[PDB]
Every structure is written in structure tokens, then in C-alpha cells.
Design a protein around this nucleic acid. Structure first.
Ligand SMILES: Cc1cn([C@H]2C[C@H](O)[C@@H](COP(=O)(O)OP(=O)(O)OP(=O)(O)O)O2)c(=O)[nH]c1=O
Ligand SMILES: [Mg+2]
Ligand SMILES: [Mg+2]
Ligand SMILES: [Zn+2]
Lengths: 217, 243, 645
RNA sequence: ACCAGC
């Protein structure tokens, strides 16, 4: 509410995450750290601009609450400043998923995260049309829920066509596949993802089984 | 949880005092235990005494556990009922009297429940509409089975039950005791039982309390709406036949 | 001989995932660790150590660790994996027989232990007692998450694999090895003429005592019958709860109008307190102010109030004379409810998904080798002589298990031994009276003719009286059995002492063997001991707590072991006869209370085979140790555990 | 302290 919290005036510390599955090197790379204010330890994520200047803090408690310290824009992404190009990006849903993906690749592919999630993804993707023009492939990595499928269906409209690929997961998102030893599936869904198939259109070739079973009953 | 026995000091017994994992001891011989308004009424200010209700039948430990305490402010007798949260902190109160002049203090939310701060895991839940029936079911079951109760009457059934959806989702069988209705709860889980009186207190004060407990453990399934089958009409098809 | 340690995600009831495992060896001295992806290599190492003819050392391995491996190796990678019981050894089953007395030696050490570990055979408590403990995983993980800031949800930290789990697993196998060296550093059980870290499964078992073998067989079988369970009926106990929960809510309505309320001092602050019949102060006060004199003062200022003085109580008001019976019935109904359905360890809070109850059975929990039962106690349910007893034992039946291939219920057989400690007495004193006492026991029933000779009303009262006289009573506690005075309490002692004058000679023999001097204090007793322990039937040092219970710890510690070998032999004959143990076979053990066994089988012919071979097993027990008596049992057949009592 | 069991 007041201002950007400095780590010195809030007893900041860049450490690992044991119960989540993120080491301290990735948190040192991104800028996710923990402050000690009001007695209770509060986790905090840092938002930067395209240049690299700090624009916003995001403070989360031990009971999963949200707290914005100031002006919260729509063109601010969590993990955007570190990369200024490339050939393949992976867009996540939350914020720990960015640390989860950059943990398992040693900072080789550009990974960004959304600032609102799945509720207001269309607003933060319509204003971010110009940043994704310098890219070559886009891999959307959202939740395997109803809101996740609705967000990946409605957010692929304002993006450039021919580059948006959607991957599937057996977990809820990338973090449970990181915890349960499924580190072999998420590395294949980035390199080889599913192409365009919006709901409503059905190709005439991939309909053999339904027409086979339909004339049986 | 019980661990083992230590020798007591006040009564001088050998195997009387029992130690527990919570840090407190208890002796079984000497019986010594060790260790609107928008204003929440303080317990040390409002002269809080946990008295019992004789004319309806409620023990003292039930009022000590549920938080239903009599205040002696202004020379009169008020019955303050407290609402809490999942962390266990005082959020809102209800001051009720003989003239039912309600004085709802504090931040009374739309999804407040009475008795949700002690009971979070289990298998069965009994939901009532008031507070006296909730205390009656706790008196019958000796304050050990999950019973919650609404806080806005039987007219906010589309709002209070709908907002608390992940709270009721943890339980396996939800049994209703409203009136002798809401469908926002997940299906295949809701049971509704029928009693011969208006509520549970009129069954407790007249000898039908056994028929309370028979409707709790063997409650029938919820027919959704006014649709019927072709077997429950068997008497009425007879009755119109004899008109 | 290798020493293995496991770590998985949850308890044996619901386990689905392997996390890590450490193996130490006594020939290469290697902390061979494993990862979550090396579970096939872990199983291959254990199968190699089995196939070369060695021993695998676990801790709590019979109950949890080996069936966890058999469950995970099936339901994670689809391969059968069974360890033979003569290869797996435990270091908890050894601790419960060598260090069988920790509550009487653990004081003076509590300066080391925190206080919650007082008298615990757990593996962390021996880490504190051996002065080798480097942290704890749960405390450090909770301190780690509070340092990061994310919450600590449920006390479940074996969800995800990490690297601290491997380190504390290595410290776990260090503590297991340092326990095993001290447990094998004992000389009464393991003779110091051979090293036990390189011998096979034919030398380690049969070049030592028999108490080290019978205890491991008993732990194996009791863990198996714990995994089987006890079939239980839920509807027939919910009907009982809804029956007698509408009775204590009438016995208080009818009673508070009789016994009125009163003001009790809390300017004098008073409060309007009402009559609570569960308290034994309110009834004492209301009987003090209604014209009753106790004439019995156990406490220094208060009387004693129980069922034997609430019968012999008379008042002037003829309403209270009827009200006292309702008070006793209310106390009975309150105890019934708190045991059956409303307690923290009730029956309806330990029923699994398949409709069975799993209760822990400690094979060596008492100092005299008697098994204890816990979580819940299936040796403490009300018998058929107490009110609401048959309705509580009819739910604990074996006909509540319909078969999984033909849809039919099963049959139950229950086998009880007769005159067990009273016949062990005739074994032990047959060298004094030349064996003319062990002939009348074999000539007709003993307790019925004892009831005839002592004019007791019931056989249960005669059976209580004979052991009350035998295990060193006083002048009044065996006159109280008939209710009479110390004159009859003296003449019954003289009558049953002048019949066979060998009990006093045996007691004098035990006193001349154990104790040598006993100085007398007017409020205490100071004794210089000579031998605090007694050699049992298989060389085990049975500990003696008090010198007037020496006949007790000589009789029941020799009576528990014949039942402990009998329950082993009565399946060693059935498996070798050509049957199959478990629910998918032909029979299954369900419960072992202190004397009798309860087995459930598929057909009546299998019931007849079991009820035949129990006699042959008991006779082989009686022949293996050369008893001077003749042991005999008695079996019953039925649907549930109300006819088979 | 009370109850229950073996
Ligand atoms: C009743 C009782 C038995 N016991 C002992 C006697 C037995 O060895 C064992 C179980 O006792 P019981 O099985 O009750 O008696 P029993 O086996 O001698 O007679 P029967 O089977 O023919 O009815 O525990 C006690 O130590 N104290 C007691 O109060
Ligand atoms: Mg272990
Ligand atoms: Mg017997
Ligand atoms: Zn005391």
C-alpha cells in the first residue's frame, strides 16, 4: 500500500523452496524472495518493466492472500525483463510455474508469466500484442481445469495465429508434475506440443471411431 | 492424547495424575486441572456467566463449548451467541432477549455459521436453521459430532449455503433439519429427514427425541422437486377412489 | 547380514509410492543408497541377499516394513516379492524381550530424553538413549517452511521427495546399526563363542536360545492376523447406540426432578448448580443430606462410592430407594456409550472401508510375557454376563464376511484352554507332594467341584476366589467375594491351606531362592536383593517387581508361553496339512485374547479340521517342555462371537 | 479414583 518494499528495510532473503520444489538459484535469478514484516514471514514477488526497473511488489501471506503495493498495470509480466527475443516462449498461469519451468532447464528458454492469471487474461493479452511479435513459437501452459480450458480457449484469439500451441498435462499444472517425478513429460510438451484445434470445428478425417460406434447402437 | 501416569503432588497419589501431549496434566483423585452497534461485547465487561437453560434443557459444558453465554448488562438478561472463523477468532455476535430485539454487532458476513470453528473434518453433518435446535442435537449427541447451523434464517438458503461450497464439500453425507430447501450442494450426498413435530426441541421436550436420533443415522434420500413416482401415490389413488 | 532402512509416503493402510532406501553391509562396509528410480535395484539387492543365504535386519520390519515392500513391488511395477520369515529379523522384537523393563529404569536418565519419550521402544528414543542423534526430520522441515514462509498444512511431509529425506534415512540406519551392536552385545541370550554378523539362517536361529525364535514367530503371526482384521457389523451397533442413547436422556429427566438443584459458593458469590449423576461428589453430598452413614472410609475425609456400596445403602425416603437403582443404570449406560460409540477410541472410529477393525497387538507388553491390546482394545469388550453384553458381542462376528466368490458367509471356531495357570501350579509343585495333586484336576472338572466344596453361588465366583486366595490376598479381600467378614475370610484360607500343604512350601522355596533379607519400615520396605530375575520356561529373564508377587510372576509368565507356542503350532500344522491362510484361502485368525483364539473358516469341515488339530498342537506343546500335567482345551463352533465365547 | 478383559 505504501511503496515498494526494500529488502533491507524488510529483512529480505533469497533462499530455496523446499515444500514447492524450487532451489535458491532460480529464485536468485528471478527475484522471488521473503520479507519479515509484522512478525509473520511474507513471501514477495517482484514486477519489472521492459527496461529492468522495479515497478511493483506482490506480497502473499501464509494463508494465500494477495496484496499489491501500488500501481498494478496490465502490461506487466512476471519474468518478462530477462529475455528480449528468441524462438520459443512458454506462457504459464500462476507465478510459481515460471520458477518450476526455469528450474528444470537451467535458464535456456524464455519463460514468462501472467500478472492476473486466468480471470483477466484477455485484458493482459490484448495490450501485450506487440511483445509477442518478436517471437517464433508460443506454448501456452495453463491449468487442466474448466477455467484453464476456458482461458486457453478465449486467450488464443487476440494472439497471432500460427504460433499458439497448447500442451496437455496429467497433473493440475507443472508443479505437481515437478513434485511427483514427472519431469520427463513436461520437457516433451514444451518441444512437441499440440497444434491448433479450437472447439467447434471437427476435421472430417479424424472422425472414424465416432461414426463406427454411431451406426452400431 | 493420553500418554502415561505421573505421581500427583496435591493429593499425593501414585498413579492418579495423567500426562498428555498438549502439555497439561489431570488427576483423577484430587480433581485438580493444571496447565446496529459495531461493537463486540467484551466478556469481562458484559458480566459473562455460562448459566444453563432449565425450561428447554441444556447443560453447562455445551454452552462453554459452543459459546452461548448470558450477559447481565443493564440489569437484564441477554443471551449472546458468538460467531467465529476458521482461525478461531471472534467476528460477530447476536444479542437476543425475550422481545427478540436483535442487536447484530460486528462484521456479520453473508456466509456466517454457528459451530464451524470447532468442526472441520468428519463423515456426517447435521444442519439446522436456528440455534436452539443445534444445541438440542449437541445435547443428544454429547457435543462430539459435527453439527453446524445457519445465521440468517431459512430465507437465505440460496445465499448462505451457496457461498460455503468448499466447506461442505469435505463431508460425505450432509443431513438437513430445516423445517418439518437448497440444491446448490453436490448431488448424491444430501439427505433430508422428517420429524413429527415443528423442530427438534418440540421432539426433545415431549418424548420424541428417540425419533430424532433414528432420523439422523437412517435419513432417507433427497427427492429433488415435486415430481413423484408411481408407487408413492398408492394410498391417494385409493383415496380419490373413495370420494 | 545387511541392515536396510526404508522411507515411503504414508502408513501401511494407504501406501502407494516409494521414496528412498539405504542398505549397509557387514562384508563391504558400504552405505549403498538408493533413489526413487532405483526401486528395482533395491529389490534385486534384497533378493540377492536372500538367495545367498543371509539375514536382512530391519527395525519394526515384521509389522510395517516388509508388507510395505510386498505391496509397493506389486502395485508400482507388477512383480511378486516375498521375503521368507527365516531371513528377516527385527530389532524391535529383540528390544521388547531383552529390554522388557524401561519404566522402572528410565528414571535417572530423564535429564537425555525430552519427556515424551519416557519408556518408548521407538527408533528415535534409542537415538536419544545412545547419544547419537543429529536432528529430527519433522522439526527441521517445519522450521524450514516457517523460514521460507509457506504454511505447514497437515503434518504430512512425506509427500514429495527431497534430499534431506536421504540424509535422515542414513542417520536412521546408523541408529539401527548402533542398536543392533548393543542388542547382540548381550550374553544371556547370545553366547560369546561365535560372531553373529556372518552366520546363516540355520546357525543364527538354532545356535542360541528358543526365546529368540518363538518371539519372532509370534511377531510374524500376530502381524499377519493384524493385517487380516476382525469382521464387524455397523448397523447392529448403530441400532444399539440409538437404543441406549434414548435411555440416558430419560434417566436424567426422571432424576433431576427427584434430586433438586442447589446454590454452591463459587457479597458471597453463589451459583445454581444442578445434579450431575456421573459425578461421584454430587451423589455423595445428596446421600449425606438424606440420612445415610457410609461406615467405610477409604479416603481420609470422603467415603468410597461404587457398585458394592450403592447396593447396601438404605435411606428414609422411599423415592430415593428407587432413585439409586436409576443412578446405577445411568452410570452403566454412560460407560457403555463412551466405550462403544462416543469415545476417542470407540468402535465406530476404527472401522475401515471393507467393514473390518484392525487393532494393534503388542506380543510382549507386560513384564510377564503377556500380550497387550491397543487402538482399540479387543480384549476389553463386555462379556455375556454383563448387561448389554450379548448385543455388543453379536456385532463382532465372523459371519459378517460374505465370500468373494460364492456370496456366502463364513463359520467361526473358538478354542479356549481349561485350567491354565491352575494346572501350571500342579506342574510346578509336583516335586513336593509327589504328583497326587495333578490327578484330581484330570479327574473331572476342577472349578465345579471347588464350588461344591466351598458353597459359592456361581462358578465364576469360585474361579475368582481360587486365584484370589492363590495370588497372595489379605484377610478381607477374599471374604469380600462372598460379602462376609474376616472370620470367614480366615476360615476359607485355613480350609484351602490345610488341604494341600505344598503351596506354603513352594512359597518358602521361592523366598529362599530369590530374596535373602528384607528390612522392615513402618511405612515402607527396604529389601536387599539377591536375584531380581527368574528363569522362565525358555531362559528369559522374567523381571520381578515386588517380593509378594513372585508366585504371580512365576505362574502367569509360565502360563503365557505355552499359549504363545500353541498359537504358532496350530498354524504350523494347518499350513503343512494342505490349506491356505488369509481371506482368499480357507481360514484366518481374527483375535488372540490372553487365553482363547478366534479363527474364521470357509466350511464346517475346515472348522472340524481346525478344532481337531488344536488338540494335537496343545498336546505337542505339553510334550515339548516335559510338563508333569496333561494339557487339554475345548472348542466351540458358531456364526458369531456370542456362542463362541 | 471408576469400569471392563483374561
Ligand atoms: C478370572 C481370572 C483368571 N486368571 C487366569 C486364570 C487362567 O490361567 C487365565 C484365564 O482365566 P479363565 O479362562 O477365565 O479360567 P480357566 O481357564 O481356568 O477356566 P475355564 O476355561 O474352564 O472356564 O487367567 C487370573 O489370573 N485372574 C483372574 O481373575
Ligand atoms: Mg523403519
Ligand atoms: Mg480358559
Ligand atoms: Zn491429585
Amino acid at each position: 500500500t505504501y511503496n515498494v518494499w526494500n529488502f533491507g528495510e524488510s529483512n529480505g532473503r533469497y533462499s530455496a523452496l523446499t515444500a514447492r520444489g524450487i532451489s535458491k538459484e532460480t529464485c536468485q535469478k528471478a527475484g522471488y524472495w521473503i520479507a519479515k514484516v509484522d512478525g509473520v514471514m511474507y513471501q514477495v514477488a517482484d514486477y519489472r518493466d521492459q527496461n529492468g526497473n522495479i515497478v511493483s511488489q506482490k506480497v502473499r501471506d501464509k494463508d494465500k492472500n494477495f496484496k499489491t503495493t501500488g500501481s498494478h498495470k496490465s502490461d506487466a509480466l512476471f519474468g518478462k525483463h530477462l529475455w528480449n527475443g528468441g524462438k520459443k516462449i512458454v506462457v504459464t498461469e500462476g507465478e510459481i510455474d515460471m520458477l518450476t519451468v526455469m528450474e528444470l532447464q537451467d535458464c535456456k528458454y524464455p519463460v514468462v508469466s501472467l500478472g492476473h492469471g486466468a480471470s483477466a487474461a484477455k485484458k493482459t493479452c490484448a495490450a501485450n500484442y506487440e511483445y509477442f511479435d518478436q517471437f517464433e513459437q508460443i506454448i501456452l501452459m495453463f491449468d487442466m481445469d474448466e477455467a484453464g480450458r476456458k482461458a486457453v480457449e478465449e486467450a488464443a484469439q487476440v494472439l497471432p495465429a500460427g504460433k499458439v500451441r497448447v500442451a496437455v498435462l496429467p497433473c493440475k499444472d507443472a508443479n505437481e508434475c515437478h513434485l511427483n517425478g514427472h519431469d520427463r513429460e513436461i520437457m516433451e510438451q514444451v518441444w512437441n506440443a499440440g497444434p491448433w484445434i479450437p472447439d467447434g470445428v471437427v476435421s472430417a478425417l479424424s472422425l472414424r471411431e465416432r461414426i463406427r460406434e454411431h451406426l452400431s447402437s | 492424547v493420553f500418554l502415561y501416569h505421573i505421581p500427583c503432588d496435591n493429593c499425593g497419589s501414585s498413579d492418579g495424575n495423567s500426562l498428555f501431549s498438549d502439555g497439561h496434566t489431570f488427576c483423577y483423585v484430587c480433581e485438580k486441572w493444571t496447565a446496529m452497534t459495531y461493537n463486540v461485547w467484551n466478556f469481562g465487561e458484559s458480566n459473562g456467566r455460562y448459566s444453563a437453560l432449565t425450561a428447554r434443557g441444556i447443560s453447562k459444558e455445551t454452552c462453554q463449548k459452543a459459546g452461548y453465554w448470558i450477559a447481565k448488562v443493564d440489569g437484564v438478561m441477554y443471551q449472546v451467541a458468538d460467531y467465529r472463523d476458521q482461525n478461531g477468532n471472534i467476528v460477530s455476535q447476536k444479542v437476543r432477549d425475550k422481545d427478540k430485539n436483535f442487536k447484530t454487532t460486528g462484521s456479520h458476513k453473508s456466509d456466517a455459521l454457528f459451530g464451524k470453528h470447532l468442526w472441520n473434518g468428519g463423515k456426517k453433518i447435521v444442519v439446522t436453521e436456528g440455534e436452539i435446535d443445534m444445541l438440542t442435537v449437541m445435547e443428544l449427541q454429547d457435543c462430539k459430532y459435527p453439527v453446524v447451523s445457519l445465521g440468517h434464517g431459512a430465507s437465505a438458503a440460496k445465499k448462505t449455503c451457496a457461498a460455503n461450497y468448499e466447506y461442505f464439500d469435505q463431508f460425505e453425507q450432509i443431513i438437513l433439519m430445516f423445517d418439518m430447501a437448497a440444491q446448490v450442494l453436490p448431488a448424491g450426498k444430501v439427505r433430508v429427514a422428517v420429524l413429527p413435530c415443528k423442530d427438534a426441541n418440540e421432539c426433545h421436550l415431549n418424548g420424541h427425541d428417540r425419533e430424532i436420533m433414528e432420523q439422523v443415522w437412517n435419513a432417507g434420500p433427497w427427492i429433488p422437486d415435486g415430481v413423484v413416482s408411481a408407487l408413492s401415490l398408492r394410498e391417494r389413488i385409493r383415496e380419490h377412489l373413495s370420494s | 547380514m545387511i541392515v536396510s532402512a526404508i522411507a515411503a509416503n504414508a502408513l501401511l493402510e494407504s501406501v502407494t509410492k516409494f521414496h528412498c532406501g539405504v542398505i549397509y553391509d557387514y562384508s563391504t562396509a558400504e552405505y549403498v543408497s538408493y533413489r526413487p528410480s532405483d526401486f528395482g535395484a533395491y529389490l534385486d539387492a534384497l533378493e540377492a541377499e536372500v538367495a545367498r543365504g543371509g539375514l536382512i535386519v530391519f527395525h519394526n520390519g515384521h509389522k510395517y516394513d516388509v508388507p510395505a515392500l510386498t505391496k509397493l513391488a506389486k502395485l508400482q511395477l507388477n512383480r511378486e516379492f516375498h521375503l521368507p520369515r527365516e531371513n528377516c529379523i527385527d530389532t524391535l522384537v529383540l528390544s521388547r524381550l531383552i529390554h522388557s523393563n524401561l519404566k522402572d529404569t528410565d528414571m535417572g536418565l530423564l535429564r537425555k530424553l525430552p519427556g515424551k519419550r519416557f519408556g518408548s521402544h521407538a527408533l528415535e528414543a534409542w537415538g536419544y538413549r545412545l547419544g547419537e542423534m543429529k536432528g529430527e526430520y519433522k522439526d527441521d522441515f517445519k522450521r524450514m517452511l516457517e523460514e521460507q514462509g509457506e504454511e505447514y498444512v497437515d503434518g504430512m511431509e512425506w509427500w514429495n521427495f527431497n534430499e534431506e529425506m536421504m540424509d535422515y534415512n542414513v542417520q536412521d540406519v546408523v541408529v539401527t546399526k548402533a542398536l543392533l551392536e548393543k542388542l547382540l552385545s548381550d550374553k544371556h541370550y547370545f553366547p560369546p563363542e561365535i560372531d553373529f554378523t556372518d552366520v546363516g539362517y540355520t546357525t543364527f536361529w538354532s545356535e542360541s536360545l528358543e526365546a529368540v525364535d518363538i518371539e519372532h514367530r509370534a511377531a510374524w503371526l500376530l502381524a499377519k492376523q493384524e493385517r487380516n482384521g476382525f469382521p464387524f457389523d455397523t448397523k447392529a451397533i448403530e441400532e444399539l447406540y440409538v437404543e441406549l442413547a434414548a435411555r440416558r436422556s430419560e434417566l436424567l429427566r426422571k432424576l433431576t426432578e427427584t434430586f433438586g438443584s442447589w446454590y454452591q459458593p463459587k457479597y458471597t458469590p453463589v451459583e445454581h448448580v444442578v445434579f450431575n449423576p456421573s459425578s461421584r461428589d454430587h451423589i455423595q453430598k445428596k446421600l449425606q443430606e438424606a440420612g445415610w452413614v457410609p461406615t467405610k472410609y477409604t479416603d481420609k475425609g470422603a467415603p468410597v462410592v461404587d457398585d458394592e456400596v450403592l447396593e447396601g445403602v438404605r435411606v428414609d425416603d422411599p423415592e430415593k430407594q428407587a432413585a439409586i437403582d436409576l443412578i446405577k443404570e445411568y452410570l452403566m449406560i454412560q460407560k457403555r456409550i463412551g466405550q462403544s460409540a462416543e469415545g476417542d477410541k470407540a468402535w465406530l472410529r476404527y472401522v475401515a472401508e471393507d467393514g473390518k477393525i484392525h487393532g494393534s497387538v503388542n506380543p510382549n507388553g507386560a513384564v510377564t510375557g503377556r500380550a497387550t491390546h491397543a487402538f482399540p482394545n479387543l480384549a476389553q469388550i463386555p462379556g455375556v454376563r454383563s448387561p448389554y453384553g450379548e448385543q455388543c458381542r453379536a456385532a463382532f462376528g465372523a459371519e459378517h464376511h460374505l465370500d468373494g466368490i460364492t456370496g456366502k458367509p463364513w463359520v467361526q471356531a473358538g478354542i479356549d484352554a481349561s485350567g491354565l495357570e491352575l494346572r501350571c501350579l500342579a506342574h510346578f509343585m509336583a516335586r513336593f507332594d509327589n504328583g497326587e495333586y495333578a490327578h484330581e484336576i484330570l479327574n473331572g472338572d476342577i472349578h465345579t467341584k471347588n464350588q461344591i466344596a466351598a458353597e459359592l453361588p456361581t462358578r465364576d465366583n469360585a474361579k475368582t476366589f481360587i486365584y484370589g486366595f492363590l495370588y497372595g490376598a489379605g484377610d478381607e479381600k477374599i471374604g469380600q467375594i462372598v460379602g462376609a467378614g474376616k472370620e470367614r475370610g480366615k476360615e476359607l484360607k485355613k480350609k484351602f491351606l490345610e488341604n494341600t500343604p505344598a503351596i506354603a512350601a513352594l512359597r518358602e522355596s521361592i523366598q529362599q531362592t530369590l530374596v535373602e533379607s528384607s528390612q522392615w519400615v513402618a511405612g515402607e520396605q527396604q529389601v536387599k536383593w539377591k536375584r531380581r530375575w527368574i528363569k522362565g520356561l525358555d531362559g528369559r529373564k522374567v523381571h520381578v517387581r515386588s517380593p509378594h508377587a513372585a508366585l504371580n510372576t512365576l505362574l502367569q509368565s509360565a502360563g503365557a508361553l505355552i499359549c504363545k507356542l500353541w498359537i504358532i503350532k496350530t498354524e504350523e500344522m494347518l499350513v503343512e496339512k494342505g490349506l491356505k491362510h488369509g481371506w482368499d484361502g480357507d481360514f484366518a485368525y481374527m483375535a488372540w485374547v490372553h487365553d482363547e483364539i478366534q479363527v474364521g473358516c470357509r466350511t464346517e469341515e475346515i472348522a472340524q479340521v481346525v478344532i481337531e488339530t488344536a488338540q494335537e498342537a496343545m498336546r505337542w506343546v505339553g510334550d515339548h517342555w516335559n510338563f508333569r500335567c496333561l494339557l487339554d482345551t475345548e472348542g466351540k463352533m458358531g456364526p458369531n462371537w456370542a456362542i463362541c465365547h
